[PDB]
């Protein structure tokens, strides 16, 4: 049907070539996955040699890494915001490798606040004191405050992330192939990559 051959097309000189044989089965191609945001729908295909391949049609959740902090957790996927290859892919919300996405900040915030014994995403005292202060302060015999200098002297996060945590969303990049692995999975944007894509997002519409 669809095929990926080299012989249907012309040579260096601009000259044509005539067909050598009928279409062979090892020259095959197949339609694209076009993965959307939505509750899990995966289908499987048999491939050359009798092996299996996984094709994701809908995904709602992924695995993401905050490489700066050595933390990775299972996280909800919210929206797609930039695509370097084609604007119709963000207009129709399709998920592919090196796409830029928004993810839920919550499991990183909960890891940080319990690891460093400090607040992160907080606005004012009404969202600090009335509950869950007992995550931050407890009885800690000979481990109370000064021994947390192992934590507190390296706790400060970049200003570009502290502005994202207060809105409840982080920017991330997809590293897996979702139409081939069945998974959407990647890493949190940081540093000069974060500066580059914030400029590109703002310069397109804002």
């Amino acid at each position: 049907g669809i095929s990926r051959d080299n012989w249907h097309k012309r040579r260096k000189t601009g000259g044509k070539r005539k067909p050598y044989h009928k279409k062979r089965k090892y020259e095959l191609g197949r339609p694209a996955a076009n993965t959307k945001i939505g509750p899990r729908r995966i289908h499987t295909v048999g491939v050359r040699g009798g092996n299996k391949k996984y094709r994701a049609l809908r995904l709602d959740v992924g695995n993401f890494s905050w490489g700066s902090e050595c933390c990775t957790r299972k996280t909800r996927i919210i929206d797609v915001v930039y695509n370097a290859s084609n604007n119709e892919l963000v207009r129709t919300k399709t998920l592919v490798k090196n796409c830029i996405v928004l993810i839920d900040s919550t499991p990183y915030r909960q890891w940080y606040e319990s690891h460093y014994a400090l607040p992160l995403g907080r606005k004012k005292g009404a969202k600090l004191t009335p509950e869950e202060e007992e995550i931050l302060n407890k009885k800690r015999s000979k481990k109370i405050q000064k021994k947390y200098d192992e934590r507190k002297k390296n706790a400060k996060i970049s200003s570009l992330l502290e502005e994202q945590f207060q809105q409840g969303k982080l920017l991330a990049c997809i590293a897996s192939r979702p139409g081939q692995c069945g998974r959407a999975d990647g890493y949190v944007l940081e540093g000069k990559e974060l500066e580059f894509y914030l400029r590109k997002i703002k310069a397109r519409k804002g």
Partner: peptide
């Protein structure tokens, strides 16, 4: 050097956001 629509870097090199 970032003259393209996607960010340009060497694979296998990482930059620490600590210290």
């Amino acid at each position: 050097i970032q003259t393209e629509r996607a960010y340009q870097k060497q694979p296998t090199i990482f930059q620490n956001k600590k210290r």
